Amino acid sequence: STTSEQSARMTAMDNASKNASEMIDKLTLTFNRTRQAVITKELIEIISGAAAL
Amino acid sequence: GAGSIREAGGAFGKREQAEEERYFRAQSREQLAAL
Amino acid sequence: ATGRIVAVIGAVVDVQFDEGLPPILNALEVQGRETRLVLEVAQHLGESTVRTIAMDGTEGLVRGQKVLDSGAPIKIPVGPETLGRIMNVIGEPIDERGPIKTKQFAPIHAEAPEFMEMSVEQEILVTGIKVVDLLAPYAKGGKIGLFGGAGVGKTVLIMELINNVAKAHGGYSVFAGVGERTREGNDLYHEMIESGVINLKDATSKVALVYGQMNEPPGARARVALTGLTVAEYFRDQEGQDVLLFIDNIFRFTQAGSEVSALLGRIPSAVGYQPTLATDMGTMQERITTTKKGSITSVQAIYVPADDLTDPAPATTFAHLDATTVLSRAIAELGIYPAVDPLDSTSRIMDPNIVGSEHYDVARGVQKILQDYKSLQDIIAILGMDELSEEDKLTVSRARKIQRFLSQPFQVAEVFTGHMGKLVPLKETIKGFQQILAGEYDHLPEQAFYMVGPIEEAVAKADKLA
Amino acid sequence: ATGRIVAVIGAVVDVQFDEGLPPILNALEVQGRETRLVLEVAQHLGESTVRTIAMDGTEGLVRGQKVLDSGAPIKIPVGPETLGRIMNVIGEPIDERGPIKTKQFAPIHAEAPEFMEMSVEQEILVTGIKVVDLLAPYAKGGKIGLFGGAGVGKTVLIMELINNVAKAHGGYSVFAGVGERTREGNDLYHEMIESGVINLKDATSKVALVYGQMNEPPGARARVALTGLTVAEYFRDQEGQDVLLFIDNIFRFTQAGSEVSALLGRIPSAVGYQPTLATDMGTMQERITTTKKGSITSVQAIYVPADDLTDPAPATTFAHLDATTVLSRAIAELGIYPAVDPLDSTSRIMDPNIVGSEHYDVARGVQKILQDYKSLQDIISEEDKLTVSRARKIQRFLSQPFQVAEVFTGHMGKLVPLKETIKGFQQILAGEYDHLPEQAFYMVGPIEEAVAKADK
Amino acid sequence: DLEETGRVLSIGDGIARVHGLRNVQAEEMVEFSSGLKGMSLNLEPDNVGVVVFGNDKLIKEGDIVKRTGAIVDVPVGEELLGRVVDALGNAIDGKGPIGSKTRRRVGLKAPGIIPRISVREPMQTGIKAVDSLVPIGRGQRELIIGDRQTGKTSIAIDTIINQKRFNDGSDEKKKLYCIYVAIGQKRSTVAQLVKRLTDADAMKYTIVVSATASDAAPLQYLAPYSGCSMGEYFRDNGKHALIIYDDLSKQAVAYRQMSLLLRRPPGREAYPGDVFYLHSRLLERAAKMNDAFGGGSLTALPVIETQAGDVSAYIPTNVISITDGQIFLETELFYKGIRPAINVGLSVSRVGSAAQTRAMKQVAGTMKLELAQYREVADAATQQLLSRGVRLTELLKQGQYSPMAIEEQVAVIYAGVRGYLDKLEPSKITKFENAFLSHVVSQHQALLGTIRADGKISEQSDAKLKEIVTNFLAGFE
Amino acid sequence: YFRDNGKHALIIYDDLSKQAVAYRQMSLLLRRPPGREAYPGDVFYLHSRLLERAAKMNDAFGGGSLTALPVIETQAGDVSAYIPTNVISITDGQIFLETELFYKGIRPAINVGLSVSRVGSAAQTRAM
Amino acid sequence: YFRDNGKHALIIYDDLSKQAVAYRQMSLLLRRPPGREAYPGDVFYLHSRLLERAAKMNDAFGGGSLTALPVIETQAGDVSAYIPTNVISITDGQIFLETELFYKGIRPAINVGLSVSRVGSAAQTRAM
Ligand SMILES: Nc1ncnc2c1ncn2[C@@H]1O[C@H](COP(=O)(O)OP(=O)(O)OP(=O)(O)O)[C@@H](O)[C@H]1O
Ligand SMILES: Nc1ncnc2c1ncn2[C@@H]1O[C@H](COP(=O)(O)OP(=O)(O)O)[C@@H](O)[C@H]1O
Ligand SMILES: [Mg+2]
Ligand SMILES: [Mg+2]
CATH class of the missing domain: 3.40.50.300 (P-loop containing nucleotide triphosphate hydrolases)
Incomplete structure (x- = not known):
């Protein structure tokens, strides 16, 4: 049972790392998207403030 | 980014806090009876 | 009243009136067009000029073109x-x-x-x-x-x-x-x-x-x-x-x-x-x-x-x-x-005094189990399904069955799905979801609830899979 | 055509002409400077004024300073x-x-x-x-x-x-x-x-x-x-x-x-x-x-x-x-x-219709064996040690001594033709050199130099 | 005379402020003294804003602008077939001028509700995955959306090349004239594309409109509408046209440039508020007409490039809201050699199902069901699902610049869905496929001709198909 | 009126986000330059000069009071938005409601972790 | 002055973030077109023409030198902000300091993974 359990835990942690890497990639895409949107929104605010003068 | 799992307050930070509180309340009950 | 176009920018047209400035929201007819080009007054600009929004394309408009006021909105x-x-x-x-x-x-x-x-x-x-x-x-x-x-x-x-x-x-x-x-x-x-x-x-x-x-x-x-x-x-x-x-x-x-x-x-x-x-x-x-x-x-x-x-x-x-x-x-x-x-x-009629306590309880229980599933989704995604308790696994299974049973084949979707549409009465819906929440179908597979009508079709599909 | 500076804001200079407005993208020469200052037209602002971007610093510029039109872009x-x-x-x-x-x-x-x-x-x-x-x-x-x-x-x-x-x-x-x-x-x-x-x-x-x-x-x-x-x-x-x-x-x-x-x-x-x-x-x-x-x-x-x-x-x-x-x-x-x-x-030209079938297949085999070797290194079977050996030899044979380094390293530089590269990697993949050692491919040109280095 | 002529007050930001032109119409073509052209965009009380179709370097303050009296239009007709023109209809292939007798406005409104009829007849792309799972009909707007270098232009070019088997025959009803609009592409890419169409003899029924990356943004904005007018010429005369816009992402970027240079309020991703209208008024002109209007059609295959597979972005979602379905191309699939990298769980054709032929229906209903099961699974019952699905996704692969006739696709999908492939190992499927095709082409042109003329598979044709497939599979490695 | 006459009143502003939107419209049409999220520069003043008028008076002024319950709608739970943070910095405490708590059966969906009353036990009965 | 007379000088700009802020204020008040984070279009030009003046001279020009140590304060470690990006692009490497390293007992809190010197060992002695 000890050998079976150590093998099972090794494979389980391998799968957990795989899934964590997948979520990290998707969230990195989302983060880059959101930071680009935030920069664009701040630019638009500054430009609309300057255009109203 | 140390302590960022608990800092994100997700499903993993709540279970971390639950684990710490369980363990240390058990330890506090064990330390109070021996005082 | 007759005015003349002084500016055309996209769908916006400025019209200058010598007499009788038309009220805001009035409809004006452009003269010299093949079809009816209606302008709706939106703003009074001053100096007897109004700004209007065109109800059709403004291509071919010339500065100075005549425009009649209808005397009323569209x-x-x-x-x-x-x-x-x-x-x-x-x-x-x-x-x-x-x-x-x-x-x-x-x-x-x-x-x-x-x-x-x-x-x-x-x-x-x-x-x-x-x-x-x-x-x-x-x-x-x-x-x-x-x-x-x-x-x-x-x-x-x-x-x-x-x-x-x-x-x-x-x-x-x-x-x-x-x-x-x-x-x-x-x-x-x-x-x-x-x-x-x-x-x-x-x-x-x-x-x-x-x-x-x-x-x-x-x-x-x-x-x-x-x-x-x-x-x-x-x-x-x-x-x-x-x-x-x-x-x-x-x-x-x-x-x-x-x-x-x-x-x-x-x-x-x-x-x-x-x-x-x-x-x-x-x-x-x-x-x-x-x-x-x-x-x-x-x-x-x-x-x-x-x-x-x-x-x-x-x-x-x-x-x-x-x-x-x-x-x-x-x-x-x-x-x-x-x-x-x-x-x-x-x-807003999801209110016990309006839809009945039975309907209200079934709906609220369905939403509770779906929220609990959503809360578990993170641990399910990283640490796999096996790191949950027994009640958590039961919640996940029932919530997935409920997710499937919320789907339904439409009659307008028959053309590109082949599945005949289903019109499920309200009582049959309440009964099926009450039964799923109770556990009467914890033995059927979740694929049996996907794209069915009443719960009887779910059990028939379950008996057809096995 | 001669004009005069009417505005200086940072690296932007507005220059007004009195005859012969210069087209956009023309270079203008600012007069009376120790070093060559060149402006490039970007817009015609109207009233015979053009706006320009400077190619050098604009410090010391005076409104009214003469500017010559060169007649062409830079x-x-x-x-x-x-x-x-x-x-x-x-x-x-x-x-x-x-x-x-x-x-x-x-x-x-x-x-x-x-x-x-x-x-x-x-x-x-x-x-x-x-x-x-x-x-x-x-x-x-x-x-x-x-x-x-x-x-x-x-x-x-x-x-x-x-x-x-x-x-x-x-x-x-x-x-x-x-x-x-x-x-x-x-x-x-x-x-x-x-x-x-x-x-x-x-x-x-x-x-x-x-x-x-x-x-x-x-x-x-x-x-x-x-x-x-x-x-x-x-x-x-x-x-x-x-x-x-x-x-x-x-x-x-x-x-x-x-x-x-x-x-x-x-x-x-x-x-x-x-x-x-x-x-x-x-x-x-x-x-x-x-x-x-x-x-x-x-x-x-x-x-x-x-x-x-x-x-x-x-x-x-x-x-x-x-x-x-x-x-x-x-x-x-x-x-x-x-x-x-x-x-x-x-x-993008790694396509059998562009580089041919032979080149494409050799390149795809090399890439597949390198990915296989990465996968096997992750877990460190019968022939997988042979894949490891062939892939390590491929990695070594990807190296090359450059001529522009001959003075610093002494090794002669190699300009390997395309056919020799294709056939060398083809032969290494087929197995023609599974006996030659690992370091007989490191920093060589064609595969003949690999066998000549294996002899030693 | 400041009624037919004006003087340039200002030039820059792609806009020329002109003084005069008192009788100019809105959206009218004007001609600058340097030989360039422009469109009157803003009629103002004291000037005209002109969108210049070309470089602002060629227009100076004080230049003379004459008015041509015509709202912006392009030459249309049969005389454009085989020619490469720019966004204004000027030939850029050196083969001399276009001998066109008809001009057509580029901003004409799409037909109404009454002139239209449902899409009924098929537009054959020759691609097994498309023609079987995502069928396209004549008059449809089907979007080709995907990341960079996923095979979108390849799908469009395969369609254009496929139309040759219908344009050479005597069935005037089944002919399809093609228009390819290149927007913001490399010029060398368009030259190589025209070479590919010339080799396959597909240029004699194709018009190419080229507004490449070095062209001014107004030209890249105008090119799709010029191409659409050239297609509407066929749509309104009883003929059938296919138009590809490759791609609308770069046209939206060109229009955003023009709008930001006009000081217009940016929105999401700095795009103007009317960037949806820009594509909606365009893709609405692809219609199927009823028989009281000639019965012709215009099919549109717009292309959209996503960033890192994000299909919920602004412009992708706009075009998805405009079109009749989409063909998703994934980078994950394309990298794994699955080409065309069509995602089958995400691509859809809303109105194309009614256009699919009966034989292709008979095989593709089963293929689609089996693929849905293979997707929903991935013991001894689901293992067969996995095997069948793997064999089918190996059968869906295809080469480049080699589209297939509908009967050959039907035969291949038959050999795949009846179950004659479960014996072979997946890595050999493609092999069999190719060899099998040759067999059916070499000694069985009669069954193919019957299936093609009948549009369906009869019990006689089904029996002959079973015979031929069993015999070939028996004596095959 | 009640506050100044020894009587006690309660006012609910349902909600102040829409008042902020209307004020932004008026200001942008009056050609006043926009600020964050196009809101005018003095939207905080807009809400603070309103929420300061809720007060408890002493005996010399009647002893009346005016309690204020402003309502704020957040987008996707973004408490960090402009108007939400303004009104949170103004008031004497918040009652945070959550969608997760709502659907998990907790009704009213008050988040006792975040919900604070800066007055606290000073304004309770002894039994409570 | 020292770099031109065969002598060697070191200069510490502490810090360039505040100089960029002052320049942005001067530019916004002069009505120059703002860019990202309201910074002017030539703020990179500002810092680059400032920092390119630190140079090692050859022996025909006296052999003197000027070394520059600009300082930049990031907000929550964000090196992708506008001015951090510009100054990282201009310089020959960066000594990066962390807060976690600071409170973990590592003082100076130099993150060696993120720190880099592009001159490298050419700027060292044979023993070092
Ligand atoms: N069905 C296919 N089979 C094999 N190779 C293909 C296939 N389709 C495309 N390719 C290859 O992938 C390359 C890129 O495909 P293609 O240019 O058609 O897609 P794209 O999305 O339009 O690229 P871009 O972003 O540059 O416009 C092609 O040069 C071609 O060699
Ligand atoms: N009830 C449904 N059943 C099956 N498929 C559906 C259903 N609703 C939408 N779809 C799919 O989503 C596609 C888009 O449908 P549609 O309602 O026209 O989109 P939109 O949200 O823009 O109105 C449909 O063609 C269909 O493939
Ligand atoms: Mg392409
Ligand atoms: Mg819709």
Whole structure:
């Protein structure tokens, strides 16, 4: 049972790392998207403030 | 980014806090009876 | 009164009048055009100049071209003669069946009904859709809004509602196509002719169509919803009828205003929208209502730009509705159709004293188990399914079965799915979901609840898999 | 035509003329200055006033100071006399070796070649480098994104490409230091002098340098790429050569264009980039192409802001890139030179209809065995040790000694032809050298040199 | 005379402020003294804003602008077939001028509700995955959306090349004239594309409109509408046209440039508020006409490039809201050699099912069901599902520039869905496929001709198919 | 009126986000330059000069009071938005409602972790 | 002055973030077109023409030198902000300091993974 359990835990942690890497990639895409949107929104605010003068 | 799992307050930070509180309340009950 | 064009920028036209400056919202006719080019006065600029929004294309306009004032806003033909006909934003027939010979014309700009005219009756409207009838039921005479991104099923859902409610409806119906596909309008026209709801030979037609589609300049797309409102308002007030008003898509209205807001010379608001978004939307939506003179049940498809529900237009529309069906792209990629988000769709008659304690308890328990599943989703995603407790695994299994059983095959979707549509009565929905929540089917596979009608079809599909 | 300065705001100068308004993109010369100040017309503001961007500092400018219209865009000396020299954006020498005595001057603003001048089928540009020619080949008249910066031998690879294209094809090279650090520009100049690519004593120089320094106004940094492209265009359209053009960096070209557009008062687009980002990039890159006389192949150093590949600057640059060479430190710290990452370098002409079936199959086999070896290394069977051995030998045989390093290392440089590369990797994959040791492939040219090193 | 002529007040930001032209119409073509053209965009009380179709370097303050009296239009007709023109209709292939007798405005409104009819007849792409799972009909708007270098232009070019088997025959009804609009592409890429179409002899029924990356943003904005007018010429004369816009992302970027240079309020991703209208008024002009309007059609295959597979962005969602379905191309699939990298769980054709032929229906209903099961699974019952699905996704692969006739696709999908592939190992499937095709082409042109003329598979043709497949599979490695 | 006459009143502003939207519309149409999220620069003043008028008076002024319950709608739970943070910095405490708590059966969906009353036990009965 | 006379000088700009802020204020008040984070279009030009003046001279020009140590304060470690990006692009490497390293007992809190010197060992002695 000890050998079976150590093998099972090794494979389980391998799968957990795989899934964590997948979520990290998707969230990195989302983060880059959101930071680009935030920069664009701040630019638009500054430009609309300057255009109203 | 140390302590960022608990800092994100997700499903993993709540279970971390639950684990710490369980363990240390058990330890506090064990330390109070021996005082 | 006659003025002359002094500036043309897109859909916006400045007209200078020597005498008799026309009021705001008046309709003006451009002289020298092959078709009728109507300008709607929006602003008085000063120095006897007005700024107008054109209801058609402004190509070919020359500075100095003559413009007559009609003396009134855009007036469309209202009456029972508009039933079975198609008219555009300015009330002209676009079905090649000749003139609409009504006895009365109503302006598309009118005041909203007063506070003392409001009604309070909140009887349910069963639709045959399991998720709608269970979790966010519609009300007769209420305002329904179907939110969704691009290609999630707003038109499919609104066509299913036309099939399930409008044919079984006793009163009249008005479909306002606003900034949508023209081939979809052609499909709807010919399908209503086939199904006898529109009759080309006598006066038994029950639907009036008003179309300004996504090939139209922004003025027509901004006012065609008002034209449809005027038709429905006539049917509600002067006829006392119970009206069904389907608006697909209402977001275009707001979007059209945005497209002209810059040319009208206004400082942009958040996300580039007009500063008048909320008050324009309110002026439009407050006429879409049930008064104590007649009822209007309204189904409005609401586009969500880039799937962002915090966008100013859907976020502002949320406050005008009695029931909201929020479709989700994530749920649509799981194959579940309709893609209703069960934890984002609400209704105001989801109240024990209105739908019954049984209905209320089943709905609230379904939503509780779905919220618990969503809370577990993170651990399920990283640490796998095996790191949960026994009650957590039971919650996950029941929540997945409920997710499947919320899906349903539509009759409008029979063509590209092969599965015959299902119209599930409300009691059968409540019973099936009560039974799933109880655990009476914890032994069946979750694939047995996918795309079925009542729970008996679920057990039949389970016995057919094994 | 003579005009006078009516406004000076930073690097923007409004100049008013009284007769003969100059067209847009013309160069004007400010009068009465110790150094040459050149303005470039950007807009006609009306009332005989043009707005211009300065190519140098505007300190000491006076309203009313006379400005002469040159009559053409910025004109730079073009010819074989620019080889081995350094010039700035406006074509004057910045190496203190005297004037550049060419016979002709070319304007840095030119339209791309017409439709009927394009080549209708893509050919390969053989560089003599094994990993490049095999796994991610370069196309004639294409653009190559060079990833990886310091510590991976970027300058050695640049100089070896210069040397190899000069030897194999007889085509010269231009290097445009857009936004160049002056310290690193001096460093590059002296590494090119020591490695013989630049020769200060005879006319055997292979590369021409154009430096737009990092401390110059954004107009100079936005036009230095056009200056280098104009030199390369001369070498292509007047001598029918296959020219190389290096642009280091291309993100700095985009950044300078964005700064120039912001200075002109234009509304920024998404992420703060100029609204004309795609058309600026296009008007630059479309002049890099294969015509009926010759071709210009461009190696362009790519910097990615915030490691975001969907950022507008890389996303716009990647639309023009025909190939990619990734220099990895995980390959250099492994011992392989050049440090090209053979699994991340890509090519669009890696297609059986372009490079043939044999080349495509050899390259695909090499890449598959390298991916297999990565997978096997992850878990460290019957023949998987044989895959490990073959893949390690393939990794070693991807290395190559360069000529531009012969003085520092002693090892002779190798310019491996395409057929020898293809057949060597084919033979290693088949198993013809499963007995030769692992280090018989490290730092050799053709496979015959591998067997001659295995003999010892 | 400041009624037919004006003087340039200002030039820059792609806009020319002109003084005069008192009788110019809105959206009218004007001609500058340097030979360039422009469109009157803003009629103002004291000037005319003109969008210049070309470089502002060629226009100076004080230049003379004459007015041509015509709203912006392009030459249309049969005389454009085989020609490469720019966004204004000027030939850029050196083969001389276009001998066109008809001009057509580029901003004409799409047909109404009455002139249309449902899409009924098929538009054959020759790609097994498309023609079987995502069928396209004549008059449809089907979007090709995907990341960079995923095979979108390849799908469009395969369709154009496939139309040759119908354009060479005597069935005037089944002919399809093609238009390819290149917007913001490399010029060398368009030259190589025209070479590919010339080799396959597909240029004699194709018009190519070229507004490449070095062209001014107004030209890249105008090119799709010029191409659409050239297609509407066929749509309105009883003929059938297919138009590809490659791609609308770069046209939206060009229009955003023009709008930001006009000081217009940016929105999401700095795009103007009317960037949806820009594509909606365009893609609405692709319609199927009823028989009282000639019965012709215009099919549109717009192309959209996503960033890192994000299909919920602004412009992708706009075009998805405009079109009748989409063909998703994934980078994950394309990297794994699955080409065309069509995602089958995400691609859809709303109105194309009614256009699919009966034989292709008979095989593709089963193929689609089996693929849905293979997707929903991935013991001894689901293992067969996995095997069948793997064999089918190997059968869906295809080469480049080699489209297949509908009967050959039907035969291959038959051999795949009846179950004659469960014996072979997946890595050999493709092999069999190719060899099998040759067999059916070599000695069985009669069964193929019967299936083609009948549009369906009869019990006689079904029996002959079973015979041929069993015999070939028996004596096959 | 009640506050100044020894009587006690309660006012609910349902909701102040829509008042902020209407004020933004008026200001943008009056050609006043926009600020964050196009809101005018003095939207905080807009809400603070309103929420300061809720007060408890002493005995010399009648002893009357005015309690204020402003309502704020957040987007996707973004408490960090402009107007939400303004009104949170103004008031004497918040009652945070959540969608997750609502659907998990907790009705009213008050988040006791975040919901604070800066007055606290000072305004309770002794038994409570 | 020292770099030109055969002597060696070191200069510490502490810090360039505040100089960029002052320049942004001067530019916004002069109505120059703002860019990202309201910074002017030539703020990179500002810092680059400041920092390129630190140079090592050859022996024909006296052999003197000027070394520059600009300081930059990031906000939550964001090196992708506008001015941090510009100054990282201009310089020959960066000594990066962390807060976690600081409170973990590592003082100076130099993150060696993120720190880089492009001159490298050429700037060292043979023993070092
Ligand atoms: N069905 C296919 N089979 C094999 N190779 C293919 C196939 N389709 C495309 N390719 C290859 O992938 C390459 C890129 O495909 P393609 O240019 O058609 O797509 P794209 O999305 O339009 O690229 P871009 O972003 O440059 O426009 C092609 O050169 C071709 O060699
Ligand atoms: N109830 C449904 N059942 C099956 N598929 C559906 C359903 N609703 C939508 N879809 C799928 O989503 C696609 C888009 O449908 P549609 O309602 O026209 O999108 P939109 O949200 O833009 O109105 C449909 O063609 C169909 O493939
Ligand atoms: Mg729809
Ligand atoms: Mg392409």
